[PDB]
């Protein structure tokens, strides 16, 4: 609903009217609220510590 | 081959397998080259001096590559007591 921005129109010609449907996937940040799809989950990279520290 | 002028005109001269004396085609993807370097006293093989052998794909599929390489090295003198002409 938020990532399949689509348009549909009828074009008139010499023969019968044709139907054109054009659907564009807006980028992931284009949710009007957020960026990540609910299927993609990212994990941050931590920092290693010294296991002795004198 | 040479024309009447005398120079060599051709795309290239194909190399012949040392085991069967047959040329190696451009799509013979099972035909490999074996490189072995000579050794001096106390080991320490000197780089830059090596002997090369070509084995065709027909021999590789037939399974005679091992015995053919044994014959080639024994004839060259690189191996001893492995291949014998009298079976």
């Amino acid at each position: 609903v938020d990532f399949i921005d689509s348009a549909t129109r009828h074009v008139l010609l010499r023969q019968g009217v044709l139907g054109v449907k054009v659907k564009i996937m807006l980028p992931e940040p284009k949710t009007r609220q957020k960026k990540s799809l609910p299927d993609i989950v990212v994990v941050l990279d931590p920092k290693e510590e010294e296991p002795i520290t004198k | 081959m040479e024309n009447e002028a005398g120079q060599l005109v051709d795309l290239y001269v194909p190399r012949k397998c040392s085991a069967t004396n047959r040329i190696i085609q451009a799509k013979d993807h099972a035909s490999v080259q074996i490189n072995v370097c000579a050794v001096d006293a106390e080991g320490r093989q000197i780089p830059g001096e090596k002997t090369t052998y070509a084995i065709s794909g027909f021999v590789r599929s037939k399974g005679e590559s091992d015995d053919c390489i044994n014959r080639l090295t024994t004839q060259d003198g690189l191996l001893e007591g492995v291949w014998s002409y009298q079976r």
């Binding site: 609910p38 989950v41 994990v43 941050l44 931590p46 | -």
Partner: protein
């Protein structure tokens, strides 16, 4: 059925291999840590991932597991690989015995080991 989705499997394995020391015993604490580090769109997905993470830790504590690595037994494997006994092939003088083996050894260049076999 409660079969876990492939996204849950992959996400759980990634957080397990990334934050193994940070994990604790209580599932609710594990839920809290996942909420802290891993940003997940859905609370239900977060809880499912945390639940799989807890079960993975239960089975890993009960026994080693193959496909996850975190600065751990994946290094203890080489630590125990450096193990070396006192040369099992050394013996003293008696290795084995076989008449044809002795005949070939005597013929070629060598003399060692006694005879017996059958």
């Amino acid at each position: 059925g409660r079969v876990r989705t492939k996204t849950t499997k992959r996400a759980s394995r990634v957080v397990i291999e990334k934050y193994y020391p940070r994990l604790t015993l209580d599932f609710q604490t594990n839920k809290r840590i996942v909420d802290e580090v891993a940003i997940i769109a859905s609370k239900r997905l977060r809880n499912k991932i945390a639940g799989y993470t807890t079960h993975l830790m239960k089975r890993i504590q009960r026994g080693p597991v193959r496909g996850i690595s975190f600065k751990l037994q994946e290094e203890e494997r080489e630590r125990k690989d450096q193990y070396v006994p006192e040369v099992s092939e050394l013996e003293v003088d008696r290795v084995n015995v076989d008449q044809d083996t002795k005949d070939m050894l005597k013929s070629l260049g060598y003399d060692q080991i006694p005879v017996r076999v059958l």
